[PDB]
Amino acid sequence: NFTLTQPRAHVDLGVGYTAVCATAALRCPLTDMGNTAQNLFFSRGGVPMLHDNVTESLRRITASGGRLNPTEPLPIFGGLRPATSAGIARGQASVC
């Protein structure tokens, strides 16, 4: 595997500004303007409740009636990523 390298250099002799860019037209939107709430149970560090059943039922109820939720086994020392669903319909969902 030969590799071919060539160094180059540039400079702008501009006493002011010399180039201008402007967003002329708009193509298809990428993200989706859906209704996806934000789940705050993806973070750790706060002062928890004194009863574990309380927070467990709380997280269960919060997962009920939503789309993105932490995986149930709750892996300690992880990233707490949601379960990967199947294909997407009309674009990447945006949180609220």
Binding site: T23, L30, T31, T36, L68, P82, S85, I88, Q92, A93, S94, V95
Partner: protein
């Protein structure tokens, strides 16, 4: 922010198509992947 030039110069220099803050592969708009180099223009972010 630090004061080096006037507010007009700082404002004209801020809008320079800063790096993105999301992902273009996932469907949940995760955090920005460390190392992903893509520049998106961000208006109404420097104006708050």
């Amino acid at each position: 922010v630090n004061t080096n030039c006037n507010t007009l110069d700082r404002l004209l220099m801020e809008a320079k198509a800063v790096a993105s803050q999301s992902s273009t592969d996932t469907e949940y708009q995760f955090k920005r992947p460390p190392g992903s180099t893509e520049m998106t223009q961000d208006p109404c972010g420097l104006f708050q």
